[PDB]
Design a protein around this nucleic acid. Structure first.
Ligand SMILES: [Mg+2]
Ligand SMILES: [Mg+2]
Ligand SMILES: [Mg+2]
Ligand SMILES: [Mg+2]
Ligand SMILES: [Mg+2]
Ligand SMILES: [Mg+2]
Ligand SMILES: [Mg+2]
Ligand SMILES: [Mg+2]
Ligand SMILES: [Mg+2]
Ligand SMILES: [Mg+2]
Ligand SMILES: [Mg+2]
Ligand SMILES: [Mg+2]
Ligand SMILES: [Mg+2]
Ligand SMILES: [Mg+2]
Ligand SMILES: [Mg+2]
Ligand SMILES: [Mg+2]
Ligand SMILES: [Mg+2]
Ligand SMILES: [Mg+2]
Ligand SMILES: [Mg+2]
Ligand SMILES: [Mg+2]
Ligand SMILES: [Mg+2]
Ligand SMILES: [Mg+2]
Ligand SMILES: [Mg+2]
Ligand SMILES: [Mg+2]
Ligand SMILES: [Mg+2]
Ligand SMILES: [Mg+2]
Ligand SMILES: [Mg+2]
Ligand SMILES: [Mg+2]
Ligand SMILES: [Mg+2]
Ligand SMILES: [Mg+2]
Ligand SMILES: [Mg+2]
Ligand SMILES: [Mg+2]
Ligand SMILES: [Mg+2]
Ligand SMILES: [Mg+2]
Ligand SMILES: [Mg+2]
Ligand SMILES: [Mg+2]
Ligand SMILES: [Mg+2]
Ligand SMILES: [Mg+2]
Ligand SMILES: [Mg+2]
Ligand SMILES: [Mg+2]
Ligand SMILES: [Mg+2]
Ligand SMILES: [Mg+2]
Ligand SMILES: [Mg+2]
Ligand SMILES: [Mg+2]
Ligand SMILES: [Mg+2]
Ligand SMILES: [Mg+2]
Ligand SMILES: [Mg+2]
Ligand SMILES: [Mg+2]
Ligand SMILES: [Mg+2]
Ligand SMILES: [Mg+2]
Ligand SMILES: [Mg+2]
Ligand SMILES: [Mg+2]
Ligand SMILES: [Mg+2]
Ligand SMILES: [Mg+2]
Ligand SMILES: [Mg+2]
Ligand SMILES: [Mg+2]
Ligand SMILES: [Mg+2]
Ligand SMILES: [Mg+2]
Ligand SMILES: [Mg+2]
Ligand SMILES: [Mg+2]
Ligand SMILES: [Mg+2]
Ligand SMILES: [Mg+2]
Ligand SMILES: [Mg+2]
Ligand SMILES: [Zn+2]
Lengths: 59, 50, 122, 86
RNA sequence: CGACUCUUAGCGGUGGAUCACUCGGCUCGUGCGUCGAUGAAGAACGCAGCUAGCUGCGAGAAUUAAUGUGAAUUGCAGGUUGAUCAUCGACACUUCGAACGCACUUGCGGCCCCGGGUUCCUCCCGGGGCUACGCCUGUCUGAGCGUCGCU
RNA sequence: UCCGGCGGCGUCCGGUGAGCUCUCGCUGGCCCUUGAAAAUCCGGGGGAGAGGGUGUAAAUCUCGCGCCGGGCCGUACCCA
RNA sequence: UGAAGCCUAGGGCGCGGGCCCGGGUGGAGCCGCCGCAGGUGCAGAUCUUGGUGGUAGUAGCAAAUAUUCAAACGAGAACUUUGAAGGCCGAAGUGGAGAAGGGUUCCAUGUGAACAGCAGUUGAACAUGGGUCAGUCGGUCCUGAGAGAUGGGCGAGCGCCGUUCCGAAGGGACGGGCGAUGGCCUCCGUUGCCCUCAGCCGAUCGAAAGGGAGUCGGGUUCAGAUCCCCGAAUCCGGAGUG
RNA sequence: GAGGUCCGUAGCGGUCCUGACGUGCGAAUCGGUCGUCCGACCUGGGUAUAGGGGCGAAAGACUAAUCGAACCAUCUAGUA
RNA sequence: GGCUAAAUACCGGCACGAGACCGAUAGUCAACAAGUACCGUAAGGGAAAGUUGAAAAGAACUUUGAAGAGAGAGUUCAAG
RNA sequence: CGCGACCUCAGAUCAGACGUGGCGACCCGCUGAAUUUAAGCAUAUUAGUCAGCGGAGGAAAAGAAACUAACCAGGAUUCCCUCAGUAACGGCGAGUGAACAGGGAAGAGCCCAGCGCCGAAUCCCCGCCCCGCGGCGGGGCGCGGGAAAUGUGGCGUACGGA
């Protein structure tokens, strides 16, 4: 995902859990040279990222 | 420098976004006097201040 | 359809919040479609969804602060936001009563010697 | 060595951007701004530079509050009431 | 004859003078004569379906509500119970900045209260409200081998 | 083809050095030169105290495992 | 049915300043007379600004040994790429990596108007898109040379001096007592009050080379790896019922 | 195995050719030849000293290509 | 020891109206994305830049060329 | 020893308030040059001016005689015409330089302290009830709390007053 610069990793994972009802393993964030905050969110192994991506609509 | 600070990084981000050219559909408006972006900046000619 | 702020005034705060949440969900889906590359229809409708967000939030805020002013109507001490925001000098200015009340000595002078209305023959 | 070969040692800067006026005039060892005197409460401003006075003054920025104050003074600072409902 | 050079004229170039325009200046006059801790001026960063600058606006972000008006905006798309414009009194208004928890990296806090953790048992997470200097009136708690009174 | 594909085999035995570089250690010389502070952590001296009345033991453990968490910013490339 | 302006081997007038006709170009305004007013007439000032010549297709494109053959792509090859050959740097490098500084120049795709002082199928050029992941690398923490508030003093004043100096400069704590509370009111915790104990050298700033616990190996991209994946660890903090 | 010791690399500097260049590669560079090279040594970063002032192993030297008094704006269209 | 309207001042500000003023090297530095681009460590310094046509009707189509660029054709009263 | 007043002086994230900064054409208060002129230059001039600092308002400042005069007298302040380039100042050089009276614009006067007399007759805040409210005021009720005799309010101020 990409988020605004004010979000913590805890805030990001809580938001992901609420909006997409998926458990989250960890989060890695970096502020991109454009300016936003790219966040790599690794899920719990018992969920499937490809399935969640199809559910959200990106594929 | 690879060892930046947050304010400087935001500054560079804004000017990197600013350094793009002009869209073509604006050249077709009614009251258009603009023919190209005159506020361009090349990393080697103009040195951005700082 | 066309959400407008006249049939939203009579509603209740809980379905106001629920409708706001639904509109936010739709806006998030529309942004997903935008980034993945979608139809000009959705790209146009994102503006409408944003303005629906804006007016629902405006209705919520207006009703909340109106009830709050009604609550603080009678009390002597009320929050600075509910206090009147005229200019700083006008807030520092003397109030209407004390700019009018006068001393006993010269009000006695006024009642003893009132200004008269006269005329002089040519 | 007075010119071209001494221009090569210029590699660390004496000024940075400051928080009041955003110009690149904040001396780092003095820890003051050469344009506005940031640590001082009052704005640095002189009458021997009319151009400097004109470059940043009241009519220059956004007028975010002041133009609204003007628009309200033209009606007398009305409050509380709203136009007659339709 | 020829080439080259010189002069004049026609046409063609380079160049942008002159002429005619002018949503701009300058000068005079009239009315008014209004900023800010309820957070100013200035600055920074963001906001457009396609958007760099200018303009406008502030996470409700090229605007919301209300009133007037009354069928458009438009470069290309898209889909009258009120489109668009203007007015503007309701609501909202990011980060610095007198700038205010301490410092200004955006780092480190403290206190009270909510919701997760907990099932108060503390930690840990999120949110909300306070925490600057001077000074006035009053309140409380105090100090003095300062002046006394009763013991 | 789309392969951290599948397989075999092998990854051995010795000697030297005022060698070069790095590092650890001992010892000496030089000074009218004596060659940083603080955060932080630890050990010791003391003995105010606490634990239970013979047990299913109590206080207490710098011992061995087990459980949870670690936020914010920088990180591309050039370096002549 | 053609004003201003401009051009003219056309016709003329005036001693002259100048002016009137004809032709052409041009496309929206202009002039005579009587008075009034002036930022009112240029050849010069090493005058100001803009433009153009001769010089002249001239000077020049000579610091650091060096290139050749074939093929490919391409409209096009002295200069691009592949292969071969011959050379140079020669480990105090023309190698591999960082700090300051730069700020997207990094990677891919496409283009050949402009730029790369010849050219270019190439480029750090232009246009589209991509790309920087940390408890264990650094900042953040410490203090150094020094900087800097408050008390105080000085100062017409913005303010300055001063850093322990002319301050009632502490908001902490083992424990004991009192008062309330929650949790099986057990025992503790939150506290609220009192008793008792208490030097700090002065708030605060100051090092990405000083001080400062704790992460290594293999694999993975086009461009990121002690950061991603796999496998092995480790430090700090916390934990009623431990 | 001592020395503000000698020859001589890197580094630091800048003698002579009054060489090259002198509308330059360059508003001070290039070549050969040179001085020193364990010390009054060379060097990054931090920090202090500011203009009739600073700093100077002292040449009126350096103080952003500016120094026998820097630079910027103003008095100022200064006076001739 | 103290208070006090009017007549008075106003090159900043919000609105206005006018001129024997200037007419794009003029008039404000700025008629235009102007205190903008750009230069300086900084204080500060600081531009050039207006006009197709009534209406884009902004040159379809054929042809040579890799393309720029031409020849025809066409719009317009006029591409002079 | 303790307790209780008062006086001085602290500490509060105590309850409620207020100041800071900006603009600055006009205004008020300090500070304050040197170009220049004198055909040189030092007093003088430039000039109480530029620069510097502080503080406001819609204007500010001033203002109701410890005045002008010497008349047959006028009567707060401010602005205009004149007085007047005058009296005066000045290396008596260069240069500088007002005021009264007269005519207009406007026109407005007032309050304390002190001396005294009225049983502090005075003021503020908290709580409660009714009313009003976007200028937080009106009434009533509190054996509610404070300020105040080291002086609040009424009368009263040079034109006299009780
Ligand atoms: Mg360069
Ligand atoms: Mg009285
Ligand atoms: Mg420095
Ligand atoms: Mg000021
Ligand atoms: Mg001729
Ligand atoms: Mg022209
Ligand atoms: Mg945008
Ligand atoms: Mg609306
Ligand atoms: Mg409407
Ligand atoms: Mg720091
Ligand atoms: Mg012992
Ligand atoms: Mg790297
Ligand atoms: Mg025309
Ligand atoms: Mg004229
Ligand atoms: Mg001329
Ligand atoms: Mg001429
Ligand atoms: Mg030739
Ligand atoms: Mg030649
Ligand atoms: Mg060369
Ligand atoms: Mg290398
Ligand atoms: Mg490399
Ligand atoms: Mg590349
Ligand atoms: Mg070329
Ligand atoms: Mg100081
Ligand atoms: Mg520190
Ligand atoms: Mg460090
Ligand atoms: Mg030696
Ligand atoms: Mg030697
Ligand atoms: Mg020499
Ligand atoms: Mg020579
Ligand atoms: Mg030569
Ligand atoms: Mg000195
Ligand atoms: Mg020396
Ligand atoms: Mg001098
Ligand atoms: Mg008196
Ligand atoms: Mg008086
Ligand atoms: Mg008129
Ligand atoms: Mg022009
Ligand atoms: Mg101009
Ligand atoms: Mg022109
Ligand atoms: Mg012209
Ligand atoms: Mg011109
Ligand atoms: Mg033109
Ligand atoms: Mg024509
Ligand atoms: Mg308080
Ligand atoms: Mg003086
Ligand atoms: Mg003289
Ligand atoms: Mg003279
Ligand atoms: Mg002289
Ligand atoms: Mg003199
Ligand atoms: Mg004088
Ligand atoms: Mg002044
Ligand atoms: Mg002020
Ligand atoms: Mg005001
Ligand atoms: Mg006044
Ligand atoms: Mg007064
Ligand atoms: Mg009197
Ligand atoms: Mg008089
Ligand atoms: Mg006379
Ligand atoms: Mg004088
Ligand atoms: Mg008079
Ligand atoms: Mg009259
Ligand atoms: Mg009295
Ligand atoms: Zn500043």
């Amino acid at each position: 995902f990409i988020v605004d610069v004010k979000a913590n990793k805890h805030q990001i994972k809580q938001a992901v859990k609420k909006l997409y009802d998926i458990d989250v393993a960890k989060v890695n964030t970096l502020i991109r040279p454009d300016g936003e905050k790219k966040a790599y969110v690794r899920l719990a192994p018992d969920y499937d990222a490809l399935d969640v991506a199809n559910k959200i609509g990106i594929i | 420098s690879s060892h930046k600070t947050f304010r400087i990084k935001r500054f560079l981000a804004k000017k990197q976004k600013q350094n793009r050219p002009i869209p073509q559909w604006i050249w077709m408006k009614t009251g258009n006097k603009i023919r190209y972006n005159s506020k361009r900046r090349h990393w080697r000619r103009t040195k951005l201040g700082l | 359809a066309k959400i407008k702020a006249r049939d939203l005034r009579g509603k209740k705060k809980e379905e106001l919040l629920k409708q706001l949440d639904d509109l936010k969900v739709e806006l998030s889906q529309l942004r997903v479609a935008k980034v993945t590359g979608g139809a000009a229809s959705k790209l146009s409708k994102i503006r409408v969804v944003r303005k629906s967000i804006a007016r629902v939030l405006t209705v919520i805020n207006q009703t909340q602060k109106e009830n709050l002013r009604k609550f603080y109507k009678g009390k002597k001490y009320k929050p600075l936001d509910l206090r009147p925001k005229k200019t700083r000098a006008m807030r520092r200015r003397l109030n209407k009563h004390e700019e009018s009340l006068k001393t006993k000595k010269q009000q006695r002078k006024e009642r003893l010697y009132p200004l008269r209305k006269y005329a002089v023959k040519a | 060595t007075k010119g071209t070969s001494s221009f090569g040692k210029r590699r660390n800067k004496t000024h940075t951007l400051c928080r009041r006026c955003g110009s690149k005039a904040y001396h780092l060892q003095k820890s003051t701004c050469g344009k506005c005197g940031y640590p001082a409460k009052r704005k640095r401003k002189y009458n021997w530079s009319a151009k400097a006075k004109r470059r940043n003054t009241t009519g220059t920025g956004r007028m975010r509050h002041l133009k609204i104050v003007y628009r309200r003074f033209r009606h007398g600072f009305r409050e509380g009431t709203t136009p007659k409902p339709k």
